[PDB]
């Protein structure tokens, strides 16, 4: 049959299957077509869109620092650095066709149809993101461009979680901790990304009291990610 | 059963 | 691209766990017709091995869930159609590898060493695609699983000694097949066992510091015994 045949509840169930077999490409293809359907995702919906995109942009990622890696280390061979530079070429290739892609969902559908502002901090988090991703493998103009958006795309679900979100919500937390990764790794401020990951645990841990037994557990397993990142910048 | 630290970034996947 | 490009291509792609692209590089490799290299031969045997990996990983998972689906017939249907698309891509990574195994590992291999080498692989893909075959097919597939088995089994027995892990290896496929698609425990033991026994008699006489993959794979056969006697 096919994607454009198939209802939401289908395209679900396909989706938690792929999941399951470890098959993100599936994944991702099932909850792209779910997106493009044009109605605001739940919360199971949204988390197997992100899921799905983070294990397929990730395998990328992980790939693109593995051959750069090599790349440094190389012997100056002709034919090995040719080869070795057209395959991390290939894999940018893939990772800009990705990130494009997760980019056009947002733009498109994700963003404008987020009714509530949880949503939206969370969407303008991951165009953030994918811009971040976009950026680590960028040159030249093009790179102030990707890095220009990402930072705004964060700044903007910044002033947004600001507003309308406490301290210790998830998705704040994880704002400050992906936009201070930002600044320390992409802009390479590492005082702004310590001061602003240290803002964010401070304000929250002053705020542990008001939590029950769930949402402290929600809000300290982020709360360790920025503190663990400070350990690591700071020593 | 036959022969054969990074800094940290975050998704949030709320229930 | 020449011979070393494609080597050092899918040297790249295995860092990178790219065994798609792995496999494709020393499929290439494969068809330009010269014998391979004992490092080429390993980097062609992973690269496969992880690409029909996968999808036998998958396979597994999404036949699990499609079995114990009760009171669902819709995500039932989709696990079947699922597990019908993972099977076909099984079936043409493992035509592949077999395609390459008579067309030119098989035929350009003289040393027994190599005829075993390549023996086993064919009895393994052939086991792979027993795994999921039904009727006409999996007789099919298992008695030439069998076959090839067979064959590396009787050359190595002549001329290789017991501590060699490629025998070693082969010993342990050959009992994992009467194990899992036989299901005749007892020829998957006796197989297991005799190997074992033998490279121990051989491994005492020697200094096991220069055998280290030997008894890595001792240690299999030794875990696959104590695991089916029990």
């Known amino acids: 049959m096919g994607s454009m045949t198939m209802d939401k509840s289908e395209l679900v169930q396909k989706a938690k299957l792929a999941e399951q077999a470890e098959r993100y490409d599936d994944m991702a293809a099932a909850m792209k077509a779910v997106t493009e359907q044009g109605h605001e995702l739940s919360n199971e919906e949204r988390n197997l869109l992100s899921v799905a995109y983070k294990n397929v942009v990730g395998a990328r990622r992980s790939s693109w620092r593995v051959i750069s890696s090599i790349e440094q280390k190389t012997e100056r061979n002709e034919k090995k650095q040719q080869m070795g530079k057209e395959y991390r070429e290939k894999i940018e290739a893939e990772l800009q066709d990705i990130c494009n892609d997760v980019l056009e969902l947002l733009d498109k559908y994700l963003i404008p149809n987020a009714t509530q502002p949880e949503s939206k901090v969370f969407y303008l988090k991951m165009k953030g993101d994918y811009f971040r991703y976009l950026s680590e493998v960028a040159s030249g103009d093009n790179k102030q461009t990707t890095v220009s958006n990402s930072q705004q795309a964060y700044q903007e679900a910044f002033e947004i979680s600001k507003k309308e979100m406490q301290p210790t919500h998830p998705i704040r937390l994880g704002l400050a901790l992906n936009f201070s990764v930002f600044y320390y790794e992409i802009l390479n401020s590492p005082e702004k990304a310590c001061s602003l990951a240290k803002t964010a645990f401070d304000e929250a841990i002053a705020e542990l009291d008001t939590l029950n037994e769930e949402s402290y557990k929600d809000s300290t397993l982020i709360m360790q990610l920025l503190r663990d990142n400070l350990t690591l910048w700071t020593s | ?15």
């Open chain 2, 1 to 15: 059963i036959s022969v054969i630290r990074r800094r940290q970034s975050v998704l949030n996947l709320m229930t």
